[PDB]
Amino acid sequence: YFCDQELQHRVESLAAFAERYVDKLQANQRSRYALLMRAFTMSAAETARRTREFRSPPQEQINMLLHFKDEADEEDCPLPEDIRQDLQDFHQDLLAHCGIQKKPQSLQELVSHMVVRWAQEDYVQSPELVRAMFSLLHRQYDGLGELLRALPRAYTISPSSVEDTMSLLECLGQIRSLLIVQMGPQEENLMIQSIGNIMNNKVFYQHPNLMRALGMHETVMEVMVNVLGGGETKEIRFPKMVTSCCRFLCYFCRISRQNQRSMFDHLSYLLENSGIGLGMQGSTPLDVAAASVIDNNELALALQEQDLEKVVSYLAGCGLQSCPMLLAKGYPDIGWNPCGGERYLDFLRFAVFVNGESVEENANVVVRLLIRKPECFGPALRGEGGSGLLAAIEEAIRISEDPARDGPNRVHLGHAIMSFYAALIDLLGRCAPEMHLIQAGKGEALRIRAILRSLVPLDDLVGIISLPLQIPTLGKDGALVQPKMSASFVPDHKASMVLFLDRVYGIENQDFLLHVLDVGFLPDMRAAASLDTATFSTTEMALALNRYLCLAVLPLITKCAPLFAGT
């Protein structure tokens, strides 16, 4: 405990010098900027200082400022010699405090002589005594190393945020104390409250570096491990606990990209623990994996082929067996769980499409594994059955039509089938090679493109584009009969359809362009023009139709506008 207090004194003094030295160096750098702006005659020096000192990231320029410790690099820095000597003197003070430099005079010498004296006195037998004694010896002999390890946990907080920092520390202490407690109702409720308080605290998103330095992302991951140890056996325990833990972790990933990196570092556990019965609804390990992989390209490149193999295995399982939860609910047995299939397809979508671009390596690996396991494509695309995507879509429409087969928040199996097919086709479309690769004519790009072309036929795609959709019309008595949300065919299906269409079969001829125009595009235009009136314009399915329009099919028209010439 005494050595811990000594180390705390060391880091506190380091923070004190941090404050003083950033004040001095900030004043010096501001005066340097003013002098450089004044001195327009020194063109080369002005350009060099503007590029290096004043056109660099703050960490880079502070590294350049502090680089004068090396004797050779005593001229690159612009700091005054007095400031250099001040930091040097504090360095000598820190070394003297750490002991770098008869009767002991300091705690270090006292502990060293003490440990050597006991160990030379007797062959001590208590293993805990041996471990503690030699750990004390090592900390006393490695004072610089102990501070070197402690400084990652060191952080400097603005004085105006101290109240919220203390509140966050108390919530952290509550979670850490409840860690050793076995999970229960009251503990779950207290964890919900603490996670909510941490999320509403402004320091959570204000200081991601302090956030990682405290590092209770690992603590709530330990909460995940503890709850999922019992959750995996039989059914999930404390689904509210699982949902709130991804609430915290998934939002933590959305806060910053470094938080995203730290969460992506532990990607393997989340995908192994993600299951259909576990994450049958809500905020899931699949969700935190998707958050850690989405909108980020370096992490998408760092994605592991073993992780892709695992999620393809889960996709194969979803294709093979029906949902036990759905069977317990009493809905008709489908033979495959489209909800879980769609969730893993969405994860693969976020894995293979980042920053508005298609990542080549991940796309190739995913399509490779997909064609290695044909059962992942679902019953429609199976080789032996040959059911056909369009015929399966019509079957799903009639399944949602007949109440007996569509009945046992609410789970609609027909829309689940449609969403599974839409997600699979969307994944293939964003796994399609880039137009640059196609024009370059790379063998792997043309090969993957041809594989997708064989996988999905043109006639089924144009049929589902031309698939008629019901329309919310006012009833005879005045009751607006709108289609049931998440139970009827939705325009997101056609959106993914046409996304695959323009990413694999980029429209280059006017005959088939006008063919799909008369098939599905113009009828959609008529439907939206009819829905334009304010009597039905406020309906959610019409708003989703407008979203489909502007986000999917209107850009295709803008792209194919030059091809429309000579019509």
Binding site: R368, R372, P374, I451, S454
Partner: protein
């Protein structure tokens, strides 16, 4: 057997196309045995 090992005579092999990435397969579902490169494997024990 494992990849990187020289193929023994009479050993079962899985011939996979590099263009279509499809395995040579013996289809008997049509009632007549036929050869076709498709997405499930067939142990072609090609012998010299």
């Amino acid at each position: 057997r494992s990849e990187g090992e020289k193929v023994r005579v009479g050993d079962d092999l899985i011939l996979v196309s590099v263009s279509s990435e499809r395995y040579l397969h013996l289809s008997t579902a049509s009632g007549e045995l036929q050869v076709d490169a498709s997405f499930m494997q067939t142990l072609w024990n090609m012998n010299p």
